Subunit: 710 residues, 2 copies
């Protein structure tokens, strides 16, 4: 059937990525200094990766075994599968980037054009994105075929109460386990890598660039080499894991909502509870998001491939925008086709709330797509030094140092509002079209072109490593400006991807609340009206108290991340004043020690809060987490991006009279070091925290809903 043709789509993406990987291997690169530094960086990064992989693999095996014990073993198997896909994607992307960084500089040098270097860097980012999408969708489709169909978990479609009092549909619990594995792996990777990279980057910019009076990414400074290794570890690898986790979370949330809507819609006629929604429609709505994602990945591949050969571009950011818009529009049209196919076979629209049937979530998905682009504009508007806010930041650089720090904080806080307003409008439209299911489909649509998003975002760190190499080689200030412009475009794309991830995570968390109350279902409650069950009162002191807790945990979590980054930076900065391996070891030891706590916190918070106060309190905690995490993520992303791009703005001498030697440049470097643990470490960790906490709550609520101490 056509299902096999769609199952081939992730495999086609992997083959295309291997060809791009072979193209970079075929690229000469090979600069003796760059080759030696890149080989050392690859050895250190792969060793750090291997150590972290062994430890996390042991812990993940334990968690999967616990999942098999508490709930069905297929759930633990899905947990392992998701962990495998995420781990593989990160490694593939990082190796491709380590090879590609030298190729970008050499391509810009040999052709004397920015276009070819842009193409090779975008190819590296595309390798990362294709690996992300293909691995996630391959694991998901294999799960669906093996457990849903071959085992018939969807066929029975019966909630089973196993030991410990957990009642679950087998297929729904399995997909929940897959999403949970992806979330745990992504959080571990991003936290450790980000702490390492941000400690190294902050130490380098603060002492080497400022105190040592050395250019950014100076070769003599050990913190600079540690920073480039960190860029590869945290910025390249963590990014793919975070984006993949958000994408998987959106899809899994839609699937869970659909799977749980089937047993819930019953009408008691003649003392008999009749399913208001037939099973076939529910199965179709379960399969719809997977085909949606496959179509979106195909459109992403088409857009990227067309853009690479379309035309040499003088502006990298413009080409990235072209790629994103093409992928989005192709997804829109082909999803219109898929949606038309689905609305033919949908006659239960009124019972599901769907205004235009399948077309309603498609509109919702379209809305989500549009919202992403609009958010992508706003973040860009607030992060790019071409626009008014970052120019205002440079004026504050003229106005004083405390003024710089204060105005940058103000800039991020001001930046939070417009994208959130656009997002609220999108939420309203998604609900108006197709209730909670269309909210989840809009979550999916926002990341429907996740491959292109990951590619455009990962294009940045390759440019950062290339700029570090150029600064080490003392490249011509015009060419150094070219690579710094590529790095600034990459930072802008990092902010854009952070916004995409947080917005999709919000929509997924809304659907996850719906699934949480879906899990709070009982056979007697199933007879009760569905709207009465789908109830989470804020007046109840438990729910309002939990919201305060989740907000406090979110803030306390943000400081613990900074304290970890500073502690390694503290040793490094004193180390520089007092040996690249020494700073690398300081960052590595601090990250490997600090990485354990945040994931354990994110996993154990719902259990403790539920066994202490019940399920309403846990719902409140989820609420507060969603809110504070979204806000802090947008703030940190946009503020750090604006700080770094203002530093690049003044490094490009756009500010008359003042250059790298001037004191405002040192103030901007300090501001960039302040925003570094924010944009690259705190913000993304917040959205990963939000989704992992929501998934854990959805799974574990069946125990402490009635087995709660107070």
């Amino acid at each position: 059937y056509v299902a096999a043709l769609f199952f081939l789509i992730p495999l086609v993406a992997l083959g295309f990525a291997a060809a791009n990987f072979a193209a970079v291997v075929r690229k000469p690169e090979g600069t003796e200094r760059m080759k030696e530094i890149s080989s050392y960086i690859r050895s250190g990064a792969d060793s750090f990766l291997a150590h972290e992989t062994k430890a996390i693999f042991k812990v993940a095996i334990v968690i999967a075994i616990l999942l098999m014990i508490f709930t069905t073993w297929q759930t633990g198997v899905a947990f392992l599968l998701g962990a495998v896909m995420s781990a593989s994607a990160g490694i593939v992307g990082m190796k491709m980037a380590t090879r590609a960084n030298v190729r970008v500089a050499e391509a810009a040098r040999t052709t004397k054009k920015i276009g070819p270097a842009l193409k090779v860097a975008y190819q590296g980012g595309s390798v990362m994105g294709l690996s992300v999408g293909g691995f996630a969708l391959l694991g998901l489709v294999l799960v669906y075929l093996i457990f849903g169909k071959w085992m018939g978990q969807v066929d029975n479609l019966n909630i089973y109460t196993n030991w410990l009092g957990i009642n679950f549909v087998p297929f729904a619990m399995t997909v929940s386990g897959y999403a949970l594995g992806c979330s745990i792996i992504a959080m571990f990777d991003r936290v450790g890598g980000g702490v390492y990279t941000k400690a190294a980057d902050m130490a380098a910019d603060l002492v080497g660039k400022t105190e040592l009076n050395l250019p950014e990414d100076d070769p003599r400074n050990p913190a600079t080499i540690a920073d480039n290794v960190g860029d590869n570890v945290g910025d390249v690898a963590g990014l793919g894991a975070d984006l993949l986790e958000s994408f998987v979370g959106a899809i899994v949330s839609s699937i869970i909502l659909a799977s749980y809507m089937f047993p819930i819609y019953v009408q008691k006629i003649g003392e008999n509870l009749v399913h208001q929604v037939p099973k076939e429609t529910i199965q179709a709505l379960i399969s719809y998001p997977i085909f949606f994602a496959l179509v979106g990945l195909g459109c992403s591949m088409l857009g990227i491939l067309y853009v690479i050969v379309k035309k040499p571009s003088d502006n990298p950011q413009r080409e990235l925008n072209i790629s994103l818009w093409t992928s989005a529009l192709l997804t829109v049209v082909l999803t219109a086709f898929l949606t038309y196919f689905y609305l033919k076979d949908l006659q239960g629209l009124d019972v599901l709330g769907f205004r235009f049937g399948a077309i309603s979530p498609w509109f919702s998905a379209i809305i989500g797509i549009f919202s992403g682009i609009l958010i992508g504009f706003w973040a860009e508007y607030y992060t790019s030094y071409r626009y008014k806010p970052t120019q205002f930041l440079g004026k504050s650089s003229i106005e004083g140092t405390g003024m710089v720090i204060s105005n940058g904080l103000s800039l991020g806080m001001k930046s939070v509002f417009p994208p959130t307003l656009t997002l609220v409008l999108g939420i309203l439209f998604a609900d108006y079209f197709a209730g909670l299911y269309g909210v989840a489909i809009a979550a999916l649509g926002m990341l429907s072109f996740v491959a292109t998003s990951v590619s455009v975002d990962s294009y940045g760190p390759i440019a950062d490593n290339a700029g570090g190499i150029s600064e080490m080689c003392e490249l011509d200030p015009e060419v150094r400006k070219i690579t710094d412009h590529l790095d600034a475009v990459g930072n802008t794309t990092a902010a854009i991807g952070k916004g995409f991830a947080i917005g999709s995570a919000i929509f997924a968390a809304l659907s996850l609340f719906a699934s949480y109350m879906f899990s709070q279902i009982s056979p007697s409650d199933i007879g009760k009206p569905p709207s009465l069950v789908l109830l989470l009162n804020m007046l109840d002191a438990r729910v309002i108290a939990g919201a305060l807790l989740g907000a406090a945990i979110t803030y306390y979590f943000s400081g613990y991340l900074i304290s970890a980054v500073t502690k390694a930076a503290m040793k490094m900065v004193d180390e520089i004043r007092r040996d690249y391996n020494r700073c690398i070891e300081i960052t590595s030891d601090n990250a490997l020690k600090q990485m354990g706590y945040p994931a354990f916190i994110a996993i154990l918070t719902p259990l403790v809060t539920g066994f202490l106060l019940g399920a309403e309190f846990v719902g409140g905690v989820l609420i507060g987490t969603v809110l504070s995490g979204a806000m802090l993520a947008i703030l940190t992303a946009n503020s750090g991006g604006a700080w770094d791009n203002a530093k690049k703005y003044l490094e490009a001498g756009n500010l008359e009279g003042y250059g790298k030697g001037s004191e405002p440049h040192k103030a901007l470097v300090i501001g960039d070091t302040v925003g570094d643990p924010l944009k690259d470490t705190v913000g993304p960790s917040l959205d990963i925290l939000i989704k992992i906490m929501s998934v854990v709550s959805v799974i574990a609520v069946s125990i402490f809903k009635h087995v709660h101490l107070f």
Copy 2:
């Protein structure tokens, strides 16, 4: 009911008593005259703006609902403004008298007593004016109009149906909130603009010394120290206090129509009118008892034998007020609530005594939160010591360590708050949550007094450096100034906690206001409902939190903009002239945040309904509480680490060293944070909830989408 008059008379007697204290050296008199002139001019500008805004808002309240609502708005505004004016004038008079007591007697005791009397005038004025306005509201509207007697939802000429008394008390609280907003936002922007300008002129090539008479910004900085801590901090505390009492009253008034039972063909109120009236009057009597206990503690400390230890005396005042409130309110609660029918239906677990249990819980929560704030800001404890030691390692390192310190500091006080909320609820539902809110602020007078003691000490240390005081007397004044900064941090944390609980209770009262005539037949769980599974509640929740963040940022840019305008004005002596320029600029920039805080619930409700607004309130409360605790603790830790290195606790490094420069940069960063952003957040969380409570009766059914 005579107790508020006793508090007002007690403040007047202390005002007359301290005025009789000698003013001493003519030079000190001139410096105090500069400070007083600047403060009075700032007052005049803000008061003119406040008069215009208050007239407009009161007229709108009279039109939308009932004239009593606008009159109550005006009454609350008047009481708050009078308390603020009296307190600030008292402090401006008291600074030189404290300095002269320390100089002439060469002793810490008498100067401490005079400074405490100066702060006590402000605290007593706050308490007396607030409680007097409340008693007047009840006497005129509850009884003469018979609004309490009927205790029935009333449809006005515009067709809006609302319980009259609850709407009126909401209007009174709104007036108090408007005065608090003006004071805290405008004054804080002014204070940090002046403080930054003084430190900046000291730092820059054109050097005017900090805490020096020649510098106009230094005089403006001292005026601001008095403005923010005397007027603004007390304003925040009074707003939270009024919010707690009003929330309890609203809860009872709306509990009357909510708890109705249809038996056969007759609808009988599950809660009789007597129980509702008793629960309306209970928070007022609790607060009156707390004010009496606060006056007793203040009187004991002012007349206690002179002691060399000031912090012990302030703690004695606080503890005496708290314990007397605990015991006397135990008696009040047991005797007043014993004869009531229907407590179990409203959440009283242990009968009549349960709300008192909640209130004492609140008291304990307040003291514990103050401890946490101190622990994270004071250099005596580990975090600020670690910040000062890390100062050797770099400037960005200092900034990052301070950010991490604040974010880590947020957690323990919030844990205390969560435990207190859970226990207060377990005792007596949401009404007892509000009663715990009240108990935590039951001794608000002593809190405001101890808080206003601080800025007088800051001005005294500034004067000692300005007047080149004798190293023994200058050392005495420096010790008092350090004690004042510590107490300022403690009071700031306490204020943040009070604002948090007040916003929570106001949300509860908002949803109680979401009662409808048809809804009364439905089970009480159905009306007292704000489902999160609704897509509108989650969408609003994100919005209010984003607005809270945007609200914090606009303030930071405003302080820098005003400081530059002042600095250019300084380049253009006439301290009143530069202070007036700063006042005009800050009052002009204040309009946008005020429009945000007031109009967000209006627009969001008329667009999407009341569930969206409830979500907005939730997210705003959460994010504002977090950012307030963060900023307060971070600024306190930065300033105390700078003093730690000024106190040479870091071996080898003193004033002028590079770690000291990093700490100075961190302090300049934290000044617009602890003194401007945080308190404005505490005002925002509460004011948005109040506006929602009032306007929900309109936009609950008049919403576009």
